[PDB]
């Protein structure tokens, strides 16, 4: 599923991401834009052989099991495929664990490089929330 910008903002807010660990909703929407272009089915392979899955490109190195990432962990206790669902529950629940692990949203390189310090409010501008 490819979410609309405000559609995704609403879904994230409902799932408790607005101001989760202090990160306003616009941060999450911005992260999602640059990670996946709002596409739940997005996948990308990392240089180390791990793979990123879903709207927030959660990595199989630590967070989900895909059966093909040697020496990796599955800290969200989910098959990586669950992160590709049209229902973003699994992605959000896992993102909550990731963002709580010490480095906040810096875990998402694209957030650090493209959203951090920017006017992220613009990402939820005009949305009925
Ligand atoms: Cl779609
Ligand atoms: Cl957009
Ligand atoms: Cl809502
Ligand atoms: Cl915001
Ligand atoms: Cl992989
Ligand atoms: Cl994801
Ligand atoms: Cl990696
Ligand atoms: Cl594995
Ligand atoms: Cl594990
Ligand atoms: Cl599994
Ligand atoms: Cl959803
Ligand atoms: Cl933080
Ligand atoms: Cl990570
Ligand atoms: Cl900011
Ligand atoms: Na899009
Ligand atoms: Na497996
Ligand atoms: Na799926
Ligand atoms: Na999803
Ligand atoms: Na889900
Ligand atoms: Na950018
Ligand atoms: Na930017
Ligand atoms: Na920010």
Curated annotation (Swiss-Prot):
InterPro entries tied to this protein: Glyco_hydro_22, Glyco_hydro_22_CS, Glyco_hydro_22_lys, Lysozyme-like_dom_sf
UniProt binding sites for substrate: 101
Disulfide cross-links: 6-127, 30-115, 64-80, 76-94
Active site: 35, 52
Keywords: Allergen, Antimicrobial, Bacteriolytic enzyme, Disulfide bond, Glycosidase, Hydrolase, Secreted, Signal
Keyword Disulfide bond: yes
Superkingdom assignment: Eukaryota
Main localization category: secreted
Function: Lysozymes have primarily a bacteriolytic function; those in tissues and body fluids are associated with the monocyte-macrophage system and enhance the activity of immunoagents. Has bacteriolytic activity against M.luteus.
Protein name, as recorded: Lysozyme C
Organism per entry: Gallus gallus (Chicken)
């Amino acid at each position: 599923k490819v979410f609309g910008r405000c559609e995704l903002a609403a879904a994230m807010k409902r799932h408790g991401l607005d101001n989760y660990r202090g990160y306003s909703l616009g941060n999450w929407v911005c992260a999602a834009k640059f990670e996946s272009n709002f596409n739940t089915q997005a996948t990308n392979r990392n240089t180390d052989g791990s793979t990123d899955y879903g709207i927030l490109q959660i990595n199989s190195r630590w967070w989900c099991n895909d059966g093909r990432t040697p020496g990796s962990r599955n800290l969200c206790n989910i098959p990586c495929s669950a992160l590709l669902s049209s229902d973003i529950t699994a992605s959000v629940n896992c993102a909550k664990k990731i963002v709580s692990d010490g480095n906040g949203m810096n875990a998402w390189v694209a957030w650090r490089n493209r959203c951090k310090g920017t006017d992220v409010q613009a990402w939820i501008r005009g949305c009925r929330l």
